[PDB]
Design a protein around this ligand. Structure first.
Ligand SMILES: [Zn+2]
Ligand SMILES: [Zn+2]
Lengths: 171, 171
């Protein structure tokens, strides 16, 4: 994967005005992430959750179902963010399963990548890896797979950097 | 309840700066709700969901649990918003249970109030009633009840009006 700086005026989830985009972000983003979306506020249908994850739960399934079935959304963005306290470090006791299992699996699957980095750079890699795995996982969902095979859905990953005040697409 | 306009001189969930507040808002708010919060971005721990509801699922439990245990959060705000498509009289076929059940129960429980109101007034009322019921229900969650009994948690209700760029507290 590579990180491509977004140009606000040419984001792949806004090829035309006036549509809604399902924006999946993290509860501790704590800054101006939507100012890097390339979308006006009225085009954003926002689901903001622990770790910008979609897990096997009623909320994640109903939100996706409402977006595709009621709003006819054709674009989903999973936005992670540098400095995340949830997709960080090696443990957090107050984070329940399956969120904690997703991060355990990231850390074990990508151990050699993570072990090659230190401290803040490692946490930045874990943010990026979480976005990539959430995008891949969401495409394998039955509801997304059907819409993808009909060419009625795209799922995009990006990471927001509150220090550079920019978003970066995962390509 | 009554509605009281918010003042930055007396923000019930920001009696001091530098703490995190769990802000529960709706996925279709579609505007500048957080600019009416009385909070800087870095004090907002945001959970944005269908209808600004907490239903009894893993996502509720885990988000509330992480907020109270890991972040030591002492204030929760449930923010509704006028013009909501979910907390409205429009029953959309693609909204799943239990969200659709919560709204069904609201309509039948409050039908005396609601049967007398015309459309746009009935919808504003349903937004307010949904906030009030979500605040009362979240106080009965086991982790919130434990913190309330220690005087270590307050749950507040607000409604945001994007037309006037103002919040109203439910008192
Ligand atoms: Zn985060
Ligand atoms: Zn809404």
């Amino acid at each position: 994967y590579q990180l491509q700086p977004l140009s606000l005026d040419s984001v792949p989830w806004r090829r035309q005005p006036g549509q809604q985009v399902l924006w999946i972000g993290c509860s501790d983003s704590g800054a101006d992430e939507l100012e890097s979306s390339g979308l006006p506020a009225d085009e954003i249908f926002e689901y903001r959750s622990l770790g910008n994850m979609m897990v096997d739960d009623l909320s994640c399934k109903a939100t996706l179902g409402y977006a595709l079935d009621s709003l006819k959304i054709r674009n989903i963005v999973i936005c992670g963010h540098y400095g995340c306290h949830i997709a960080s470090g090696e443990v957090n006791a107050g984070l329940q399963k399956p969120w904690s299992s997703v991060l355990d699996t990231l850390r074990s699957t990508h151990r050699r990548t993570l072990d090659s980095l230190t401290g803040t750079e490692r946490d930045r890699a874990l943010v990026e890896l979480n976005v990539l795995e959430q995008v891949h996982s969401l495409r394998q969902s039955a509801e997304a797979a059907e819409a993808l095979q009909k060419q009625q859905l795209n799922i995009w990953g990006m990471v927001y950097d509150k220090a550079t005040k920019r978003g970066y697409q995962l390509i």
